[PDB]
Amino acid sequence: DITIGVIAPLTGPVAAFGDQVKKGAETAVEVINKAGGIKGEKVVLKFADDAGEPKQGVSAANQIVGDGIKFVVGLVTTGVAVPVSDVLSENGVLMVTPTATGPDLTARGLENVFRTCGRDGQQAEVMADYVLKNMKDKKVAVIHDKGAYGKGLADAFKAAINKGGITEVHYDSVTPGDKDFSALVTKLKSAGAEVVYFGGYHAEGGLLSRQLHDAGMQALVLGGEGLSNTEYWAIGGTNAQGTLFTNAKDATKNPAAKDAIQALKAKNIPAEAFTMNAYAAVEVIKAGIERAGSTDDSAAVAKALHDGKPIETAIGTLTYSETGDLSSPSFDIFKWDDGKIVGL
Ligand SMILES: CC(C)C[C@H](N)C(=O)O
């Protein structure tokens, strides 16, 4: 059997992302096995919970190494991704991230790391352009969650709007697990913040959206794809109406997504971006193995994914750079409307 390890937060404040990655990876595996597996062999998933905690991610990685598993989909959050990557890479375990966007993951010399997603510099620059074009005159604030993702992302947005001439009226952070942001909100009111970019995840983002409105403000919340989960709406309520955030292009618009959509509909799983990217990550591993001709040498599989030939996936046709990033990444802006994600 061909074993694929999945390292993902199944418990804790970001288990909602984990759930998406698991279900995307799961659905891909069923379809491949239904379609005859790899070269005639069953693909199986083995799961290991990082709880969204980098120390526990290392531990999950270690278990993955100790089971002799050679392929991994996961490394979901940037903070976990990088420390997991080292453990995986040292021990000849190939890895594909469907969600981690922190640039450092692919800039430290690693030859067996890949993404089915882009990077923060691009998505912050996308939202910054939108801000400069459409909101040059708004009081803008920049907030993060002190996290590897949160701060990197928010600092990149800040840089891009300062370059375009906009001076933020406030820069600051909150601590994951703290739930009272009334102090920060107090400063936001008094700075007259009309727009607040938040680099972080839903547990914190939702609370910021809520507590802004309770203080009587009508501020527009902006962020990255950490605000793409419906839990952000669950937490934020109607206050999050209008929230804009960046994420990959809607994969459902491509005909390449036909097979994945049907398999998901059949299981009542929504075709969300992370879910699709996790499915495509399994497809990449399969394509790697097919081109290499082996399921035993992960280095050969890695070299094959890096050899310049394009790879067909549910999210589209991919070609990897020497760093393991996508060669043609792109990010669109979406908005939360009445609990649903909509374009434009
Ligand atoms: C699941 C995503 C919100 C994770 C985020 N892109 C990160 O790199 O941490």
From Swiss-Prot:
Pfam family, one: Peripla_BP_6
InterPro entries (UniProt xref): Leu-bd (IPR028081), Leu_Ile_Val-bd (IPR000709), Peripla_BP_I (IPR028082)
Gene3D superfamilies per record: 3.40.50.2300
Keywords for the protein's UniProt record, in alphabetical order: Amino-acid transport, Signal, Transport
GO biological process: amino acid transport
Presence of keyword Secreted: no
Reported function: Component of an amino-acid transport system.
Similarity comment: family membership: Belongs to the leucine-binding protein family.
Name of this chain's protein: Leu/Ile/Val-binding protein homolog 3
Species name: Brucella melitensis biotype 1 (strain ATCC 23456 / CCUG 17765 / NCTC 10094 / 16M)
